[PDB]
């Protein structure tokens, strides 16, 4: 068990702190000409969607308490790296300039089974012609994560889609309703290409809202799993969805356990996991942790005749797909495919 993640962002100066696993030492990231990318990369590693802003700090005046020495970034390996721990070497930072960055505030309840308002501020309702069809989880104000299966050819007219947020009850007039610009679905979700296909695999879609949702105590984004963060067998997470929003505390079940118990002898496919039987389609599967020195809820699964373990899209396996689809398809209108 790793109770503390090897990448940290400071609560006082917002400085980035990276752990040297072999030396057991915390180090500061050395400042370079590609500070924007590293700030962004460091926030992504910790499960944040992006860096809001980054800053340049100096040891001479900024202190260096809690760290010893520095890590330098490989600026040549950085453009196509999926990890920060692979592109960093132990170095001496002569100028003593280190990286500080403010990440997007993510996965927290802003407190000042029927549910009460504010417990899951990321939970959204996706409505087609007024009717609730699929669930979603806000990753930001104008980005929702859900299932690909939510958009069959039948429900592809985007101007007929709406995203309901900041309300537990579907009839609540307090909750906000916004339209949809693009729907980025995984090109690897085969039941779309084949209507006789067995698969639940690559059942992930990114809903981009035409305008950002105001972030309130009722509306907030959820965290993505951290880079390398494990899905613990026996860890009890929460699944939410629907006309008042309900929650269920469900345990994570081993691949082996579900595969050894399945009645039809069906094996859980790659990029997917199972969880105990207590389930709204595309709805969230969130777990809480303190690996970032603060309790944060993270989106671990997507809901993809039986009282059997539910099968979910394992979100940690689509981290890059999510970070790429947003970088690439921000300016897109309509249905979009992302391989």
């Amino acid at each position, epitope marked *: 068990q790793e109770p503390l993640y090897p990448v940290q962002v400071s609560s006082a100066d917002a400085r980035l702190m990276v752990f040297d696993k072999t030396e057991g030492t915390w180090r500061l990231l050395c400042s370079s000409r590609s500070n924007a990318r590293v700030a962004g990369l460091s926030c992504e590693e910790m499960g944040f969607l992006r860096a809001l802003t980054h800053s340049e700090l100096d040891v001479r005046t900024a202190g260096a308490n809690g760290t010893s020495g520095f890590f330098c970034v490989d600026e040549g390996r950085l453009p196509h790296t999926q990890r920060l721990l692979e592109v960093i070497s132990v170095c001496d930072c002569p100028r003593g300039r280190f990286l500080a960055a403010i990440c997007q505030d993510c996965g927290r309840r802003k407190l000042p089974r029927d549910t009460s308002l504010g417990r899951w501020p990321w939970q959204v309702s996706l409505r087609y012609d007024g009717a609730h069809l699929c669930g979603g989880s806000l990753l930001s104000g104008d980005w929702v994560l859900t299932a690909a299966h939510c958009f069959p050819e039948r429900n592809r007219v985007l101007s007929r889609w709406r995203v309901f947020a900041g309300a537990v009850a579907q009839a609540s007039p307090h909750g906000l309703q916004l339209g949809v610009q693009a729907v980025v679905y995984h090109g690897g979700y085969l039941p779309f290409r084949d209507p006789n296909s*067995e698969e639940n695999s690559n059942d992930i879609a990114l809903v981009h809202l035409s305008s950002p949702l105001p972030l309130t105590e009722y509306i907030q984004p959820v965290c993505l799993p951290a880079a390398g963060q494990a899905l613990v067998d026996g860890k009890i997470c929460t699944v939410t969805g629907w006309g008042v929003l309900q929650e269920a505390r469900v345990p994570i079940i081993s691949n082996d356990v579900c595969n050894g118990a399945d009645f039809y*002898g*069906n094996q859980i496919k790659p990029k997917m996991f199972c969880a105990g039987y207590p389930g709204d389609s595309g709805g969230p599967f969130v777990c809480e942790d303190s690996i970032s020195r603060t309790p944060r809820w993270r989106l671990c699964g997507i809901v993809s005749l039986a*009282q059997k373990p539910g099968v979910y899209t394992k979100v940690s396996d689509f981290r890059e797909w999510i970070f790429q689809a947003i970088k690439t398809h921000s300016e897109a209108s309509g249905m979009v495919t992302q391989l």
Partner: antibody
Amino acid sequence: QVQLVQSGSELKKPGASVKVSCKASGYTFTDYSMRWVRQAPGQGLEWMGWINTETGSPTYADDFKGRFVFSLDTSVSTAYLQISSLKAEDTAVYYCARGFAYWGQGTLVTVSS
Amino acid sequence: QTVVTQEPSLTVSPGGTVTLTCRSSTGAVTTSNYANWVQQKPGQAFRGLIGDTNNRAPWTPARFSGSLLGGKAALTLSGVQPEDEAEYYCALWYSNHFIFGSGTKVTVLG
């Protein structure tokens, strides 16, 4: 047409070995696992474990560790079971199953001196 | 030492309804035991009827219901046919393995 067909009855002496077969058809063999169940004469049923077919990795029930070995041959889509150093108590009808939904007819293994 | 207990033999008349219980010796049968029911008709191969407490197999009809009845796993056979006569085995999952109940012979009374 999901079908499971097992090899014929075996008559072995104590100390010998036996490779019992289970041919699968009517589905993509790699998408679904295979499990082994034993029934000794007039006795109950025993889940012996299962074999992962996309990795080929076997899981064995406590009682079956050591002598028994689940193995595969994908090209011909068949699941195997080999019991080395056969003992008097290995006398049983051994079945293959893809979940509990689909079973083989069973293979009788008589171990006698 | 875990034993799964089934009624040795049960009678039912054509058209009648019968319920078969499955007991766990460690206590209450729960959804975590993902109770399966297997049928063996005379001379025929085994055929899974029910899995994960109440999931019906493609060949098992609607008159066949699997549930949890008073800390046990139960299998109901409604509007019984003389063809329903077989041996019924329940399998309970215990963390990492299955345990089969000794079995029940349901005789359709002819």
